């Protein structure tokens, strides 16, 4: 009924009950709020309950543009034929753009700070404001669209308002694919899985289902293990920008005021490039900022993100650990000794075996993040399979994939491969010292940092008409 304030288990509620002797919640009657995922078929007793993906499975930069036609329009700058994306008409970041504001009833951002009265932003994805580090990436991508639209307008002034948006959109999505598969994924999988689940692209395949797998939604939440308990803000000399250079994550969630009124995107990106990610260790999985203080500023109680992930997988009726190991063709541990061997940690095998009883019952994210990491990769073999399998499908099953014949020319493809996210930072911010390739590896200043001039820009000459 009302999952937000009620601990009664009436649909669509599925509240997370508190165990005896909890480190934080001493009230046993109380519980963690939970709204069950929407059924693709509400009320049916014939279909096995499934869930909806409100987004385009494609690596098309739908978090920029929108996955629904009304929101695609109410995001574009309709006042001119320069085909840009609309921006914040009330605030700026040293003259540079800021994502527009969203009209919301139950606005979570306003509850982070009453005095500032800064609401949520407006991007092609409702989750743009969840954290300033995510608002930063979002603000960078919108800026890079208007930046491309302009650079194309002066190249072809004989192009209208629609053509400009579409041609910069095309390039944007392509830059998302380029940074995903060339830069991100190898550093997620490692070289082994990268050759197994993602061999050299041949050509588009219409027989490859490009949907997101119900499992991928819980499995790709491996990133929760890479979460730093503070938002790291850094000055133009990569030093702790005071006040608040290490702001606790429980005070950054939804706090949109921190972007607008506390430095803008520039100190956030610098701190993103220069701070190390958290390392997933068998005894140190995810931080208590997200485990005890999740959305603490906006809710009647702070949630436990790793627990949500587990209940969510049950809500999505996901088969446990052993079902997926098999799906992947990996051995299936049946006992603590066997699991001990699988995890290469008998202490963890025993702790999990105590909770679950058998590894068959181990919740997919729980078992996936418990597995030891691959060579040069940030996941174990189960998540490498689930993640890899999905990305193979999103690449070969994408008719507008950058490498596919017809999407871009032989020429544009040559131009596009020169792109990188540091280069995107150079042109859309007042940041001059940038992460030397690979941006996702590089975490120490100035040891792994270079200047903006030492990077080649995207030549849009092949784009001329």
């Amino acid at each position: 009924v009302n999952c937000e304030t009620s601990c009664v288990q009436q649909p669509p509620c599925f509240p997370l009950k508190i165990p005896p002797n909890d480190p934080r919640i001493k009230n046993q009657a109380d519980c963690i709020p939970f709204f069950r995922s929407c059924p693709a078929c509400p009320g049916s007793n014939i279909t096995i309950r499934n869930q909806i993906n409100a987004l385009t499975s494609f690596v098309d930069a739908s978090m920029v543009y929108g996955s629904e036609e009304p929101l695609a329009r109410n995001l574009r700058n309709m006042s001119n034929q320069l085909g840009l994306l609309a921006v914040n008409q009330r605030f700026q970041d040293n003259g540079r753009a800021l994502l527009p504001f969203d009209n919301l009833h139950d606005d979570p951002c306003l509850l982070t700070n009453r005095s500032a009265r800064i609401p949520c932003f407006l991007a092609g994805d409702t989750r743009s404001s969840e954290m300033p580090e995510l608002t930063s990436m979002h603000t960078l991508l919108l800026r890079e669209h208007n930046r491309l639209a302009t650079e194309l307008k002066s190249l072809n002034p004989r192009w209208d308002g629609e053509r400009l948006y579409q041609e910069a959109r095309k390039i944007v999505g392509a830059m998302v694919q380029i940074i995903t598969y060339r830069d991100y994924l190898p550093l997620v999988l490692g070289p082994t899985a990268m050759r197994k689940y993602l061999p050299t692209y041949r050509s588009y395949n219409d027989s490859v289902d490009p949907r997101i797998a119900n499992v991928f939604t819980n499995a790709f939440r491996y990133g929760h293990t890479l979460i730093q308990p503070f938002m790291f803000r850094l000055d133009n000399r990569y030093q702790p920008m005071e006040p608040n250079p290490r702001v606790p994550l429980s005070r950054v969630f939804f706090a949109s005021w921190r972007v607008v009124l506390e430095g803008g995107i520039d100190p956030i990106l610098r701190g993103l490039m220069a701070t190390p990610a958290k390392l997933n260790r068998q005894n140190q999985i995810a931080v208590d900022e997200i485990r005890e203080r999740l959305f603490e500023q906006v809710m009647r109680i702070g949630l436990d993100l790793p627990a949500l992930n587990m209940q969510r997988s049950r809500d999505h009726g996901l088969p446990g650990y052993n079902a997926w190991r098999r799906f992947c063709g990996l051995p299936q541990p049946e006992t603590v000794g066997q699991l001990g061997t699988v995890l290469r940690n008998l202490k963890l095998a025993r702790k999990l075996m105590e909770q679950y009883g058998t590894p068959n019952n181990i919740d997919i994210w729980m078992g996936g993040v418990s597995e030891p990491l691959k060579r040069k990769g940030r996941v174990g073999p189960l998540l490498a399979c689930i993640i890899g399998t999905q990305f193979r499908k999103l690449r070969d099953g994408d008719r507008f994939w950058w490498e596919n014949e017809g999407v871009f020319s032989m020429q544009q493809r040559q131009a596009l491969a020169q792109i990188s996210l540091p280069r995107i930072i150079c042109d859309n911010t007042g940041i001059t010292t940038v992460s030397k390739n690979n941006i996702f590896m590089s975490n120490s200043y100035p040891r792994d940092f270079v200047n903006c001039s030492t990077l080649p820009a995207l030549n849009l000459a092949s784009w001329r008409e």
């Binding site: 165990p19 909890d22 799906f327 099953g397 996702f440």
Partner: protein, 103 residues
């Protein structure tokens, strides 16, 4: 479906011409394995107090978090070979792929 098309649609519709809602928005997730529920079709494991899963009791996610995910934050091992930007792109990319809507 149009015979000739220069760009992507906003909803993902028409990317596959044979099954035009494949990868498109506001459509059901593909399942790589059959779903697993208490009743076999709707009720999640954990739902009914008593009901066990594969012969074993259902472990509370909060308890699994408390006992397997919890550690002291001061002990945090920082990654040498990875930047916080690595964590940040994953979220941005995930938000290009999936959003399971709630009520």
């Amino acid at each position: 479906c149009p015979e000739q098309d220069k760009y992507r649609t906003i909803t993902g519709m028409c990317n596959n011409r044979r099954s035009p809602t494949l990868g498109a928005s506001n459509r059901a997730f593909v399942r790589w394995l059959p779903a697993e529920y208490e009743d076999g079709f709707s009720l999640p494991y954990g739902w009914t107090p008593g009901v066990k899963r594969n012969g074993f009791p259902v472990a509370l996610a909060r308890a699994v978090s408390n006992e397997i995910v919890r550690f002291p934050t001061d002990q945090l091992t920082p990654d040498q070979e990875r930047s916080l930007m690595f964590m940040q792109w994953g979220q941005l990319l995930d938000h290009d792929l999936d959003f399971t809507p709630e009520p």
